[PDB]
Paper text:
To gain insight into the evolution and designability of ligand binding and specificity, we analyzed the homologous PBPs, PotF and PotD, which are Escherichia coli putrescine (PUT)-binding protein and spermidine (SPD)-binding protein, respectively. They constitute the first elements of two separate multicomponent uptake systems (PotFGHI and PotABCD) to transport the cationic polyamines PUT and SPD across the cellular membrane. Still, the protein-binding modes differ: PotF shows affinity for PUT and SPD, whereas PotD exclusively binds SPD. Prior to this work, we grafted the seven differences in amino acids from PotD binding pocket onto PotF; this resulted in PotF_SPD, which will be referred to as PotF/D throughout this work to keep naming for mutants more concise.
Numbering used by the authors: 28 to 369
Write the structure that this text describes.
Amino acid sequence: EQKTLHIYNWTDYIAPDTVANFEKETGIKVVYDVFDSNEVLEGKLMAGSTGFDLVVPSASFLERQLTAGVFQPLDKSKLPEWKNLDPELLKLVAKHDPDNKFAMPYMWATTGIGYNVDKVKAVLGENAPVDSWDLILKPENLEKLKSCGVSFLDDPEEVFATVLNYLGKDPNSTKADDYTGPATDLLLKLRPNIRYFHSSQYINDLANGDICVAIGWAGSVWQASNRAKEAKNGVNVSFSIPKEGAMAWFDVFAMPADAKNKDEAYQFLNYLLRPDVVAHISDHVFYANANKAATPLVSAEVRENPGIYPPADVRAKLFTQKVQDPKIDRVRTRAWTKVKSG
Ligand SMILES: [Cl-]
């Protein structure tokens, strides 16, 4: 009988031939579906009976569901290359998944500033503060960049944390007043200069020159940069992990508790743990993978990019998302609607 495997992953988060290569090597039929919204994935998981054997949630969402019985523990004896994973990244993911019981770290990155090098330098000068959140969180700078286009993510959790860190508050403040007060105060001063709040349109807009500065996910900004280079359109997109720090986050593979094809799922996970497999993915999607054995195999342009693989001094400035109580979640959501309506 045919062996089958159903995977649900983000768009633009695998190499073009990863699945084909796996099928050639193993004889397993893969059904590979994609989503571009975390809201979509989580709704399906909470409803249950998804039909997926492997899914790719955020590490933070995993914490919220470790008690909901959504996932089943990973049998590490079926993953002999588990030893290839970076122990430091396992520790960070274990903040949401104690003892790394349910999740295999896949890729990770930061939320920083993507920008058009030429347009930012034209408007703010040669010494534009591209190494600082000042570039996009000082109203005086956004007023000058307004005409060339400014985008923020449509993501209250990441944007509020970014603002709180910049203001010198706890990035993960549990104080409702921090969100409704100082954080909202700054966002309302910036708001008239922001063209839109959206978590994917900025990728193509950066690549085509339609916006000049964005809050964005590192690898997606690097994808925009590469798309502009492949189009030979002369647009120069870069990305900055600013000097004040930034949020780091981790996407993981996990196995729904009702998965029908568990043996095949473990074959695919151990396939991903082979160093060349995940290095090849990083080469194509411009995200750092969590496999320490894989790093030397990654192309120089990606591995040596400190906005993809940050060195120790930059990693020390990164913070991670803490899961908040529902009451803070709702304050955050309410305040974000007010910010956007401004
Ligand atoms: Cl995360």
